Symmetry: C5
């Protein structure tokens, strides 16, 4: 139903505060992050650099966006410029994230938001072992760039489902674990997810 | 060529157009047609399984709320796509952004049919095995909505495919053997719902 | 008239008038005739030539002219012309059909508007084309053809109308120009029942 | 949350992003510190380095301060809502490519912290990268258009990537003042000396 | 005085017409341009192409911007979007000018504007001689892209003794001479565009 959709969008834009974190109660916003690797385009064992493509499945809640969907759309697509989005960054990225897909999020009637862009990006990590049976394991650390743990908490197979069958590489395993970083710059602590990409030449 | 009519039609389109809302009529998905007309193959990396291609992405759909009586006014106008809803199509196996080489205008017809046909340069990760053999390489490109499931958006091939190579450059060092563009459906771990795509199979070889 | 061209308040008023009456998204068809667009490519440099891939990298000044009589003003005592950001004007939606890269505009995106309604837009463009590079090393040279036309307006809406470019081409190029010729064409495409006009620019050139 | 929204609205009511936040007829004291993360490419024939670093930048605008006794201490703010120093690297030969979200932190006392991850290429002396004492690459950073009476600039094993082909021996960052041909006044700058070598 | 600054910026934005040439009386705008070379990055003797970095020192007046500064700041930095800037282009440039510095101009209380971006750009020019002792002489013409001489005059700055003063010692090249002179180009039609012709005499070290 189109008018319903347009009304939901209007509602979302009236209540959405894109530059403000949506803390519910005084708890931090829980953001779920899962990288789905699609391809591995270039590897350099010499420089320890990696060029990759992945779907960054990112979800969280803003209960204030919720509506009653008994007689209306459960979900709509929304431009992320209308929404708050976690300021995630990869601490070992050496190129800026090149978003390859339309910048739309899904908002579910319960206030859940799913943003899943396809990103091409290059990293500085441990490429040693590529041409080995065991293969290399390359570790990507992703976290909020400016919100510490009291403001944002970050939580998280072989990706047979998504990985290209045409890549000069294959994935042996991927694991994602929660992890904390604290830096000389800032007293408050930051949460990251450590994504371990275990892969080898095909 | 009545200009003031063109200006009024544009006014009405922008009054009516909701660029961020899918134009569903009744309770039926928006029926989007996509077809890739191939113009060039620029680079083919046998090492890495990548191809850089140029194609006109013929995209059509209807938004009957935009329609107008054209018995004594212009049948069609050109419109900037930022005034229009445009389907959120993406190539699921692309490895670069789609580079639009042409003016980002769509044609809106008086019955509310919309035609957007950019020329795109884009790189894909696909099977490049066989490119220098007689029977050639076959690269597969999947195009579908990035965020709308099939209850929301249907995507189908266009009726005419016989023109898929008609505009391919005779100066390309590659030549096209066959193209097929066929309906397919994709489901995933993330989302319980299904997405429609047109799978394009591009069979080509080095001259 | 000349004697009033540098009247600043007059220039600002002309700009105001243009922005009031300009419809940047609506083609300026006068009476019931197509907008007559004149296109002339003035080649400046041939940068990269590849005889294998049949690709050429070039720089040219794209002299584009057309008229919109609604922009017109009486200049017998005010500026004859002004510079205008093209984002304030309607501009033909020209595209080069055999381009294989985005046209990189290298100059300020300003057009000239003349008091009689004429609009003159001439960007410096760098762009890569897919065209015929065979024979670039011979005496008679290669002939690279570039096809330029409106991307979405057919012939009833926009019509297109078109030397050795001695005057413009870089003396320091590795290549030289024999001839540049430009012919009108009209074509119907598989997508659409109507016919689109284009210009074919034949760039006859050789390695020095 | 509502308190966050209101602080942000106050910041945007009082912030003049194109006006330097001078207090008391004193220049804005900007403190800079580069935390090198990666050395990506060293071209010995052209004397060019490609590097990734965290540009820790801080200053105060006390007209942004609020009473935090019963509201948050800090928020994140888009830098387009804030004045930021117009720092530039004088020996840069590419645009700064900002790799991170363009958010600053604003602290309830009016302190602003902006720390982008930046990838940029520099013209500097890479002679010696294949020696044990290494090469020393000097990066000169300062305000591009604000002289000393307007802006003053004042000055990595934990940060530097272990996977880099390179290794840092020593980073030093020293104040410097200069007077240029265009203009009578003097501009302050920080000279960042990066001593590094190939493993 | 910060408030004074915000007021000056407000006055400038009340008065400045960013798209209209600031002709004073009935005369052309006098723009002064000078390139201070910082670097020469790549040079190709076959293709006759150079890649250079330079500060594009640009100045002109808009008296309507002027204000009394006896008890207020004599200078402010303004974003160039708030100002009219001349539409300069290098007639033999073969890439877009990559601005490397913050896009801020200085406005001085007497109405003088200084805009001086650091630009990286590639040109087509005579690279023959670059490996000989006498070196190559590459010529760059800079002028208004759309304003003829009766609207904008382009002249060198008074000072060009400093053209190579900030040149990188770590360049694989070196500059022997720089000359920056008045020129006029004319084409079909009677209008002439004034330009500054920069002759860069350089060689490989
Ligand atoms: C323009 O103005 C002059 C008066 O200065 C008048 O004589 C002339 O007829 C006008 N032109 C038109 C077309 O109205
Ligand atoms: C801060 O607010 C608290 C109560 O909200 C009050 O006790 C205190 O006096 C205030 N301090 C300042 C500096 O305004
Ligand atoms: C600790 N955060 C995460 C990485 C860098 C650092 C940071 C960046 N911008 C503003 C901050 F307050 C802190
Ligand atoms: C006439 N153009 C040239 C090829 C395709 C066709 C076209 C492109 N976009 C919108 C159209 F209506 C038509
Ligand atoms: C259905 N799309 C195709 C790929 C992934 C999935 C998707 C992408 N972005 C947001 C979604 F909700 C779903
Ligand atoms: C100074 N340029 C060089 C050629 C002519 C002149 C020019 C360029 N673009 C638009 C014009 F109106 C004039
Ligand atoms: C301090 N910068 C370095 C070069 C010149 C000076 C500068 C740059 N832009 C505008 C100025 F006013 C001054």
């Amino acid at each position: 139903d189109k008018l319903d959709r347009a009304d939901i969008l209007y509602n979302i834009r009236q209540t959405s505060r894109p530059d403000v974190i949506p803390t519910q109660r005084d708890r931090p916003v829980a953001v779920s992050v899962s990288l789905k690797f699609i391809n591995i385009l270039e590897v350099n064992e010499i420089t320890n650099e990696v060029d990759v493509v992945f779907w960054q499945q990112t979800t969280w809640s803003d209960r204030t966006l919720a509506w009653n969907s008994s007689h209306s759309p459960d979900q709509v697509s929304v431009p992320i410029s209308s929404l708050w989005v976690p300021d995630l960054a990869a601490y070992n990225a050496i190129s800026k994230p090149e978003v390859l897909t339309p910048q739309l999020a899904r908002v579910v009637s319960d206030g859940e938001v799913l943003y899943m862009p396809s990103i091409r990006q290059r990293f500085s990590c441990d490429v040693s072992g590529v041409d080995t049976e065991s293969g290399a394991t390359c570790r990507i650390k992703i976290g909020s760039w400016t919100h510490h743990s009291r403001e944002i908490s970050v939580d998280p197979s072989d990706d047979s489902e998504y990985f290209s069958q045409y890549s000069r590489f294959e994935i042996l395993d991927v694991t994602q674990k929660k992890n904390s970083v604290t830096y000389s710059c800032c007293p408050e602590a930051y949460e990251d997810v450590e994504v371990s990409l275990n892969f080898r030449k095909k």
